[PDB]
Amino acid sequence: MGRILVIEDEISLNKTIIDNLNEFGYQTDSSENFKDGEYFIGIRHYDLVLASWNLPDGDGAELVNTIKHKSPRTSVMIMSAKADKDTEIKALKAGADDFVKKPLDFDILLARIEARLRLGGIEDLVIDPDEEKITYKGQPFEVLTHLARH
Amino acid sequence: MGRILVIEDEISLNKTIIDNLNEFGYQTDSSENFKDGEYFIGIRHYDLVLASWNLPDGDGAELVNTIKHKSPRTSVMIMSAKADKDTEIKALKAGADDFVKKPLDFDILLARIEARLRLGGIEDLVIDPDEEKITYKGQPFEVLTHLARH
């Protein structure tokens, strides 16, 4: 049960996506605009965050470069009410953590986002999830983690 | 310039994908069968490895469970000469590192696999790429790496 944030201009449509999101218990904030979502990013902590395109605050590629204020202010995931082929390709170039599309079958996205095996990555542990500073001061991998815990 | 291994039953058809692979200098071995590719996995070292389905040695879901001999013998990437909707969904459930599909536009896959921003992850460095044991015995992130190198 992760958390997936919302970046959308339509509260009805963002609730429709929030269906798929909280289908895995994803914490959400109903966005009435792209800016609404980009601030919902900062208001709370989340495991994955949508982004938009061609919204009232979505300036397309200009929004693409804008939303990554210096180092990207999260917004790892993306959303789209269409296939957004060019947008989808560009986001994949950006290596987004996830993404959602309306024409895509929602059962398929349910199975995917619900479980897609998307794995990758104490005395000295200085992990800071709030500031994205996962770190152990000092740092068979499971054995290594067990030794670190003890 | 990485390496992408091949798992396919047709040498010409797999050479078609090998085009996209060596388009980024991906080392390849022409596979005339699923077993051909699964052994090409072991013959050399690679950055990414296709897998198959419904091949002469592709037993579908049975091949899916078979190819992961105990801990998966690489084969992170997958390939398909069709949309393989069920197969694609299942592989995504497996959290594959990569994949290729024939109906998918090859320019799109060129742009993706060429550059999709897929990054993620000395005195004591005990990294073993040959045996997948990336580790530093002792172990700002760039600063940390610089300090470790010195």
Author numbering:
A (entry chain B), B (entry chain A): 0 to 120, 126 to 143, 151 to 161
What does the paper say about this structure?
The C. jejuni CosR regulator is essential to the viability of this bacterium and is responsible for regulating the expression of a number of oxidative stress defense enzymes. We determined that CosR assembles as a homodimer with each CosR protomer contributing to major conformational changes to facilitate DNA binding.
We finally refined cryo-EM structures of this apo-CosR dimer to a resolution of 3.77 Å. Residues 1–116 create the RD, whereas residues 124–221 form the DBD. All of the N-terminal RD residues are clearly visible in the apo-CosR structure; however, many of the C-terminal DBD residues, such as residues 162–221, are imperceptible with no observable cryo-EM densities. Based on the structural information, apo-CosR is very flexible in nature, particularly the C-terminal DBD.
